Design a protein around this motif. Structure first.
Motif, PDB file in Angstrom:
ATOM      1  N   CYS A 199       0.824  -1.204   0.000  1.00 43.76           N
ATOM      2  CA  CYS A 199       0.000   0.000   0.000  1.00 43.76           C
ATOM      3  C   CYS A 199       0.863   1.263   0.000  1.00 43.76           C
ATOM      4  O   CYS A 199       1.812   1.384   0.781  1.00 43.76           O
ATOM      5  CB  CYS A 199      -0.937  -0.026   1.228  1.00 43.76           C
ATOM      6  SG  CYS A 199      -1.662   1.593   1.647  1.00 43.76           S
ATOM      7  N   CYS A 242      -2.338   5.539  -1.514  1.00 46.69           N
ATOM      8  CA  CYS A 242      -2.827   6.292  -2.666  1.00 46.69           C
ATOM      9  C   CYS A 242      -2.281   7.729  -2.644  1.00 46.69           C
ATOM     10  O   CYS A 242      -3.006   8.706  -2.816  1.00 46.69           O
ATOM     11  CB  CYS A 242      -4.355   6.310  -2.705  1.00 46.69           C
ATOM     12  SG  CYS A 242      -5.124   4.773  -3.262  1.00 46.69           S
ATOM     13  N   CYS A 276      -9.600   3.070  -1.343  1.00 50.02           N
ATOM     14  CA  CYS A 276     -10.316   2.196  -0.422  1.00 50.02           C
ATOM     15  C   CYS A 276     -11.113   2.993   0.606  1.00 50.02           C
ATOM     16  O   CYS A 276     -12.164   2.532   1.060  1.00 50.02           O
ATOM     17  CB  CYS A 276      -9.292   1.281   0.252  1.00 50.02           C
ATOM     18  SG  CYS A 276      -8.048   2.276   1.254  1.00 50.02           S
TER      19      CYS A 276
HETATM   20  S1  SF4 Z   1      -6.507   1.857  -2.154  1.00 49.01           S
HETATM   21 FE1  SF4 Z   1      -6.155   1.858   0.089  1.00 49.01          FE
HETATM   22  S2  SF4 Z   1      -4.966  -0.050   0.455  1.00 49.01           S
HETATM   23 FE2  SF4 Z   1      -4.803   0.380  -1.744  1.00 49.01          FE
HETATM   24  S3  SF4 Z   1      -2.910   1.697  -1.979  1.00 49.01           S
HETATM   25 FE3  SF4 Z   1      -4.636   3.189  -1.708  1.00 49.01          FE
HETATM   26  S4  SF4 Z   1      -4.657   3.544   0.505  1.00 49.01           S
HETATM   27 FE4  SF4 Z   1      -3.433   1.647   0.212  1.00 49.01          FE
END
Ligand code: SF4
Ligand SMILES: Nc1nc2c(c(=O)[nH]1)N[C@H]1C(S)=C(S)[C@@H](COP(=O)(O)OP(=O)(O)OC[C@H]3O[C@@H](n4cnc5c(=O)[nH]c(N)nc54)[C@H](O)[C@@H]3O)O[C@H]1N2
Ligand SMILES: Nc1nc2c(c(=O)[nH]1)N[C@H]1C(S)=C(S)[C@@H](COP(=O)(O)OP(=O)(O)OC[C@H]3O[C@@H](n4cnc5c(=O)[nH]c(N)nc54)[C@H](O)[C@@H]3O)O[C@H]1N2
Ligand code: SF4
Ligand code: SF4
Ligand code: SF4
Ligand SMILES: [S]
Ligand SMILES: [W+6]
Lengths: 967, 214
Positions: free
Chosen positions: B137, B140, B152
């Motif tokens: 992770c 994001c 997410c």
């Molecule tokens: S969607 Fe959520 S779990 Fe996936 S990289 Fe972004 S923050 Fe991390």
């Protein structure tokens, strides 16, 4: 700058899966000229606020998917190969098949000499997955061709709700809406796994909990829903009516009902006639020889002018409320606890928590979806929930309602458009053979002589005439009435429904089948029989996103293509984000969505497929003549198209309706060509057309109200989440149905802190009032003939009060409430080799037969294979370990699955014997993915209710055995 | 910097977050099979940065305690993965000074990947067998620096996922903890002074996952 979204055009859409109706944002490359590059949630949408469950969240992978169909495929008789063909070839040949079959089968008069003008040699399945405009065009194309066997998904999960709620409230729709759940003080989830099957609904369910609501899940299994409720109460399969009957008795014994609401707004005060009675599990008027009731024995006593008599004091012994009390006095806690398997302690807990919402300052809602409402008495299950809600004052109020959750994105709309054998659009019935004239058709509508009873269905002749004007504008409605097919008055209605269609197919009685947006080779019960029966068709047309178990049934398990003569056309349609149109969600919100990328490859929107198909049929009739060409030749399809393409906008404006001439109606003057502003201004004399009166108001001279994205709200609107300027809901933007019951007879809310409507300065403020009129001058259930919420419901085939009759045939032999074991108006074999109760249900990650989601690698990733969920007790009995391969078998077929051994399943104690349930997802099929497994419908029986035409998928007998491998 | 507050007492295990993470980054799916559990993928991997872990615990009376744990990098305030990687090559693991995101770069292929994974108290890093690059992770961070929520977080229907400035998120975590404790007396926050992904557990965090806390 986010490179991924740089240079891409953003558009809005609505999720193509379940009926929550979540909003999406689609980014399409090359400023709209390329493929989709991203799909995620629309942060501004008031229902999901950007949230998406994994199905919505993976729509990008659904659309930009190199397993999609790219062009039409043709399978010749006895061939083992698809041949790719052009759209012109496919549609020309299909039109030829339609015409040849219609010409050879068309019947102007039936065997009694009555006009029917129908063909019985073609059937159609589908679909709640098409846009509303496509659904409406599709049904009218089918009926113009003369079809009567027109069915889709709604038959299974939606059809029981409609008569149950219509009997009780006047309409079959979900009474409130998703955002309104956050206003509830107690949420009873029963017959629903909403956290998996309507996931964004738990946004609002948990917000209610945040404000102090109690969440109750009543379910035979512990699910992802149960994990997040305050109370999980296990219930034995099929014991719901005892559970609800016990709650009715509890409410009545403890005076927890809202007297003022009950007295004024339900039929509690109506005097039932002396012929009504109930004895030994049978209502009066029972015809033993035919296992049917003479319902006239249940009539109300009428006054001089034919209005049911009332005792507002509620003291007369034959008042509904007093008959109600007598009926349910048998449903005491110890009997209910014995049959439900719910402990007396939990029953008391649930009953106390939920019946507390009979206070006017508290609101309770019931959420149910499909559950086990498909058996013989599922309608009476729903009737009991409706009666509980009326006793507690919960109908019409914020956080109240019967929230009958719709399944699919547009199953509300596809039912609204009459894709079921018994209804035209707008819930006008399909005429039977004895309705020989439009006047006879209109004469069947019940009238009322109670000046407080709105009885809105008396306006039906306006809606029928305007619908006929929409199809045939140059004809008089009485003339056009003869163009559409009629069903036989002598036959039982279920002869035209889903299950009998598979039955007639297995008997070789259909030459052609449209499988339009459905996968019957997996979705129909008793898949082995249905797969074989499809081989008795001359031709099959499958319109679908992907090759699938239905399109390719001829090369499925155990099939020899060289022996199967069926001609198959596979026509690939485009996904939801590749087309424009509307879908009506569970709360009746009719939401407009837009095209992102253009259709992938050579796929087409359904509307273009069907319109081009119908136009080719039209051309063959203009060149060759044939059986009764007029309904085909005269159909108004000019209004469906623009720029040589199917036009969602023009079809939506026609469904709303418009004036065919200058007209004076309701004290105002309208010009020819103007959109009809609401169904109030429709007429019966041909001045108006309207494809669906429920849509009159959705697309007016003010523009497309379904396309509104306006979050403006007054304080009272925002306090309960009406969002009246976001999209449009039928009818005329009434977001909470029956909201006149939410106020007293001066127009003040029972619950001012959660007002729905309020009389202020001579007008109703808040929601749109459901029924015009000064406070205290109209009964609040305007679609009821008599105007009242019906506790006593004498139009139901099983009796005017729900009564427990055992739906579990094999393991139960005793009914604690009567000597009548099974439904008296309703042949399981119960072979002792299959001693467990199989059931099928859903998981969050897959959709229906899995045709769509088994093609999405991220969803297969999370749920790759059919599994079988069993208790630790059953796993011990059969020597099954968790993760073992098992064979599940029935009299109907057999499959292998991966065992999931879990305490989320526990045995039912029935008559002192442990009875074990076996859980299966029905999301799988032999076509894809590798090692996914096949459909759980290999196991299910094709026997269904005599009276509902629905197959049994929630309780069917199976065995489960370990499959061994090498030591 | 930024912080997640993850309120596991609200999770329905819908797995929207698991799928949204792959959609935003266009990550491949793994080959999976059902071995007696809804959980899949069974583990984080080079192509799976978040998976929802399922754990069933017996309880008196009906039902179970069903524990759901969407696992992701904790974006540690003082990340030992960076400390270990810096032994071989600085710049393989960096820290965004604005968000606090801990970020793996393509230079992770040039460090001892297994020792970086072993340095993590949460067993989070995963190695590509082909290239030897590490993945996990990334908060994001691209979306965050451009004004969007993590994929997410945005997709979550229940309010389990929360994201914002660390001071508002810490205050929220403390207030939510006090409330959740009224139903779940054993509720605790996971290592809340050391990480940027602060989970509220409704009981012993190790019941959710052996590496749920350090
Ligand atoms: S969607 Fe959520 S779990 Fe996936 S990289 Fe972004 S923050 Fe991390
Ligand atoms: N993720 C996902 N969501 C879906 C769908 C899907 O395929 N996948 N399908 C959509 C459609 S088309 C539909 S119609 C709806 C259906 O929505 P649901 O009715 O929620 O679907 P089910 O999971 O089949 O059944 C729900 C619950 O009913 C319980 N149940 C079984 N028998 C009984 C009984 O006798 N009494 C009671 N009280 N409960 C019982 C089951 O254990 C199950 O938990 O979901 C829609 N939503
Ligand atoms: N054992 C068991 N059987 C059941 C049920 C159960 O609970 N248990 N549930 C029943 C119920 S409630 C239902 S809803 C049915 C579902 O039965 P089906 O409708 O036959 O199931 P699917 O084909 O999987 O539904 C998804 C379909 O939507 C199509 N689709 C999506 N978008 C479009 C479009 O734009 N145009 C067209 N033409 N098609 C499109 C996809 O191609 C796919 O075929 O299954 C029923 N059968
Ligand atoms: S499947 Fe239902 S809950 Fe999930 S994103 Fe689509 S509409 Fe929303
Ligand atoms: S999206 Fe939210 S509710 Fe669904 S599994 Fe992820 S954290 Fe839990
Ligand atoms: S959780 Fe592990 S991989 Fe993530 S920042 Fe902390 S030490 Fe590094
Ligand atoms: S449905
Ligand atoms: W359905």
């Amino acid at each position: 700058e986010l490179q991924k979204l740089q240079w891409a055009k953003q558009t809005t859409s609505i999720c193509c899966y379940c009926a929550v109706g979540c909003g999406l944002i689609v980014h399409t490359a090359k400023d709209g000229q390329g493929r989709a590059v991203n799909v995620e949630g629309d942060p501004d949408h008031p229902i999901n606020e950007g949230s998406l469950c994994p199905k919505g969240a993976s729509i990008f992978q659904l659309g930009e998917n190199d397993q999609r169909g790219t062009q039409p495929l043709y399978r010749a008789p006895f061939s083992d190969t698809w041949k790719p063909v052009t759209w012109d070839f496919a549609l020309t040949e299909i039109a030829k098949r339609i015409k040849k079959t219609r010409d050879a089968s068309f019947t102007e008069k039936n065997a009694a000499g009555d006009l029917v003008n129908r063909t019985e040699a073609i059937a159609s399945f589908g679909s709640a997955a098409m846009d509303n405009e496509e659904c409406w065009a599709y049904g009218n194309i089918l009926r113009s061709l003369g079809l009567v066997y027109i069915e889709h998904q709604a038959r299974i999960x939606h059809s029981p709700t409609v008569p149950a709620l219509a009997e009780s409230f006047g309409r079959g729709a979900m009474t409130n809406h998703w955002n309104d759940l956050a206003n509830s003080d107690c949420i009873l989830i029963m017959g629903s796994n909403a956290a998996e099957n309507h996931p964004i609904a738990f946004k609002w369910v948990l917000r209610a909990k945040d404000k102090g609501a109690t969440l109750i899940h009543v379910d035979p299994r512990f699910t992802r829903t149960s994990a997040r409720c305050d109370v999980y109460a296990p219930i034995r399969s099929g014991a719901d009516i005892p559970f609800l009957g016990g709650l009715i008795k509890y409410i009545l014994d403890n005076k927890l009902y809202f007297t003022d609401y009950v007295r004024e707004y339900t039929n509690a005060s109506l005097i039932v006639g002396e012929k009504f009675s109930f004895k030994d599990g049978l209502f009066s008027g029972y015809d033993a020889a035919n296992k049917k009731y003479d319902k006239s024995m249940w009539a109300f006593e009428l006054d001089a002018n034919g209005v049911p008599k009332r005792d507002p004091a509620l003291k007369h012994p034959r008042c509904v409320i007093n008959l109600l009390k007598k009926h349910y006095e048998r449903y005491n806690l110890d009997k209910v606890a014995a049959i439900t398997g719910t402990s007396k302690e939990q029953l008391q807990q649930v009953y106390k928590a939920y019946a507390a919402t009979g206070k006017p300052d508290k609101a309770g809602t019931i959420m149910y979806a499909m559950g086990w409402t498909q058996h013989s008495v599922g309608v009476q299950n729903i009737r009991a929930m409706a009666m509980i809600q009326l006793l507690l004052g919960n109908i019409g109020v914020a956080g109240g309602g019967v929230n009958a959750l719709r399944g699919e994105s547009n199953v509300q709309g596809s039912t609204d458009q009459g894709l079921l054998a018994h209804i035209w659009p707008g819930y006008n019935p399909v005429p039977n053979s004895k309705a020989a004239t439009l006047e006879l058709y209109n004469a069947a509508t019940p009238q009322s002589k109670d000046p407080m009873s709105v009885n809105w269905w008396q306006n039906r002749p306006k809606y029928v005439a305007s619908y006929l004007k929409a199809l045939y504008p140059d004809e008089e409605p009485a003339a056009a009435y003869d163009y559409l097919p009629r069903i036989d008055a002598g036959r039982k209605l279920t002869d035209y429904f889903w299950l009998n269609i598979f039955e007639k197919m297995d008997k070789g009685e259909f030459k052609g089948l449209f499988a339009w947006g459905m996968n019957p080779a997996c979705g129909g019960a008793n898949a082995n029989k249905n797969r074989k029966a499809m081989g008795k068709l001359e031709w099959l047309v499958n319109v679908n996103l992907f090759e699938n178990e239905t399109s390719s049934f001829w090369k499925g398990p155990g099939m020899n293509p060289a022996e199967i003569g069926t001609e198959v056309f596979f026509l690939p349609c485009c996904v939801s984000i590749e087309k424009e149109g509307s879908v009506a969600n569970s709360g009746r919100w009719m939401q407009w969505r837009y095209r992102g990328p253009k259709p992938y490859a050579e796929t087409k929107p359904d509307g273009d497929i069907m319109l081009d198909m119908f136009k080719k049929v039209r051309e063959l009739y203009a060149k060759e003549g044939g059986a009764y060409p007029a309904p085909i030749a005269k159909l108004n399809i000019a209004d469906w198209e623009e720029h040589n393409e199917f036009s969602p906008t023009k079809v939506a404006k026609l469904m709303n309706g418009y004036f065919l001439k200058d007209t004076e109606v309701g004290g105002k003057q309208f010009k020819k060509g103007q959109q009809v502003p609401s169904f109030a201004f429709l007429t019966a004399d041909g001045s108006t057309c309207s494809g669906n009166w429920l849509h009159a108001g959705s697309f007016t001279d003010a523009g497309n109200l379904m396309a509104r994205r306006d979050k403006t709200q007054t304080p009272e609107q925002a306090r309960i989440g009406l969002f009246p300027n976001w999209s449009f809901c039928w009818p005329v933007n009434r977001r909470i149905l029956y909201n006149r019951a939410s106020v007293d007879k001066t127009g003040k809310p029972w619950n001012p802190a959660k007002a729905v409507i309020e009389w202020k300065d001579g007008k109703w403020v808040g929601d749109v009032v459901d029924g015009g009129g000064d406070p205290g001058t109209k009964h609040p259930f305007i679609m009821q003939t008599h105007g009242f919420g019906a506790l006593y419901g004498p139009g139901r085939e099983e009796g005017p009060f729900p009564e427990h009759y055992e739906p579990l045939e094999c393991p139960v032999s005793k009914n604690p409430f009567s000597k009548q074991l099974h439904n008296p108006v309703a042949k399981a074999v119960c072979d002792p080799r299959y001693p467990f109760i199989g059931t099928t249900y859903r998981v969050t990650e897959h959709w229906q037969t899995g045709l769509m989601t088994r093609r999405c690698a991220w969803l297969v990733e999370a749920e790759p294979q059919i599994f079988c969920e069993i208790s630790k007790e059953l796993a011990k009995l059969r020597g099954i370990g968790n993760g073992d391969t098992v064979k599940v078998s029935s009299l109907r077929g057999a499959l292998e699955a991966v065992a999931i051994v879990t305490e989320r399943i526990r045995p039912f104690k029935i008559e002192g014997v442990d009875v074990h349930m076996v859980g299966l997802p029905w999301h799988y099929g032999w076509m894809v993915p590798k090692n996914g497994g096949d459909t759980a419908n290999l196991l299910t029986p094709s026997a269904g209710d005599p009276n509902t035409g629905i197959p049994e998928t929630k309780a069917f007998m199976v065995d489960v055995r370990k499959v061994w491998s090498h030591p | 910097g930024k912080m997640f507050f993850v309120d596991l007492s609200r999770c329905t295990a819908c797995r929207g977050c698991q799928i949204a993470c792959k959609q935003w980054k266009n990550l491949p799916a793994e080959e999976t099979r059902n071995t007696g559990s809804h959980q899949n993928p069974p583990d984080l991997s080079y192509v799976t940065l978040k998976t929802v872990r399922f754990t069933e615990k017996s309880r008196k009376g009906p039902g179970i305690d069903w524990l759901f744990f969407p696992e992701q990098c904790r974006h540690c305030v003082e990340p030992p993965c960076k400390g270990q990687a810096d032994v071989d090559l600085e710049g393989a693991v960096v820290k965004d000074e604005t968000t606090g995101a801990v970020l793996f770069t393509e230079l992770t292929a040039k460090v001892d990947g297994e020792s970086v994974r072993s340095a993590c108290p949460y067993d989070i890093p995963r190695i590509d067998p082909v290239t030897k690059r590490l993945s996990k992770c990334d908060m994001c961070n691209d979306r965050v620096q451009n004004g969007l929520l993590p994929a997410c977080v945005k997709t979550c229907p229940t309010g389990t996922m929360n994201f914002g400035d660390e001071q508002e998120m810490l205050a929220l975590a403390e207030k939510r903890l006090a409330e959740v404790k009224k139903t779940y007396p054993g509720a605790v926050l996971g290592d809340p002074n050391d990480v940027r992904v602060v989970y509220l557990f409704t009981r012993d965090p190790k019941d959710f996952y052996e590496h749920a806390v350090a």
